[PDB]
Amino acid sequence: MLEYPIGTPQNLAGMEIAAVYLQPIDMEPEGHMRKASESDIHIEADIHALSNNPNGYPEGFWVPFLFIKYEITKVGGSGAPITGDMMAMVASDGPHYGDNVKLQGPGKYKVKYTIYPPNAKENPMSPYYGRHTDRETGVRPWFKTFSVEWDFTYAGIGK
Amino acid sequence: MLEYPIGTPQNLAGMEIAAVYLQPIDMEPEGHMRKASESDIHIEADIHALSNNPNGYPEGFWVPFLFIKYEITKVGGSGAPITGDMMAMVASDGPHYGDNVKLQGPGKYKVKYTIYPPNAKENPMSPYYGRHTDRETGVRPWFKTFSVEWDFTYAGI
Ligand code: NA
Ligand code: NA
Ligand code: NI
Secondary structure, three states: OOOEEEEEEEEEOOEEEEEEEEOOOOEEOOOOOOOHHHOOEEEEEEEEEOOOOOOOOOOOOEOOOOEEEEEEEEOOOOOOOEEEEOEEEEEOOEEEEEEEEOOOOOEEEEEEEEEEOOOOOOOOOHHHEEEEOOOOOOOOOOOOOEEEEEEEEEOOOOO | OOOEEEEEEEEEOOEEEEEEEEOOOOEEOOOOOOOHHHOOEEEEEEEEEOOOOOOOOOOOOEOOOOEEEEEEEEOOOOOOOEEEEOEEEEEOOEEEEEEEEOOOOOEEEEEEEEEEOOOOOOOOOHHHEEEEOOOOOOOOOOOOOEEEEEEEEEOOO
């Protein structure tokens, strides 16, 4: 099956941030993702460490415990922006942040991700992840919440 | 970076499970780890995917969202077992599960880890992680909770 790129990856705070979409998926636990039959796509945020990542991740590692909010808007057209929170999950090609999304038909869409670090008050995983701070094994502070945007042309499941 | 081994790694459920320890650490958020000055070691569970991991992890990837309990027993042995829950955290060499621990002096110890998958009701990370189940991108079910044990000799510091 086809995985569609959403623009080109952007590099910030020692991380590569990429956006992709595919057909809606099914996930355990059930009842968290919007039903696949009631969705158009499964949108994903692919976040991996660059070389010399300041938070201690080896190059290519998945960056875990982040919280991602998205806003998808049909470019210059009728309809409200489509918003939601991604969920961390694993697939046959590894761990991703993603969500099943219902769109507003074929056309151009803006896609914006707002990426929250593990220590952000909005991130629900903040009580469950730490960062070493001692001189010997410590790392630099977490990045501050930031956004990245792209656009893509949605045509459906016409493959 | 210098760490000390606790026995040798064990391969189970498509994962390499290793136990290591180093000097006590400091962590953000503060006040969660036992104070470094009140600890002897920082104990770690190093868990990485093997080749053909059944849950979709590429070989060498850190296995995230696990919940790990530990029990450390001094072989003879007048003290109570040392117990705790590890916390996931990142250090200059990458992410680990770890905890600051106060031991019961030099000697031989048994170390047992109980590893909970990310869908276990006992695991507080379970509400935050999922697994694709569709034919095209899906993975095999999570492993069942299991334990691993090692012996090691502690001499300080
Ligand atoms: Na496009
Ligand atoms: Na703090
Ligand atoms: Ni996904």
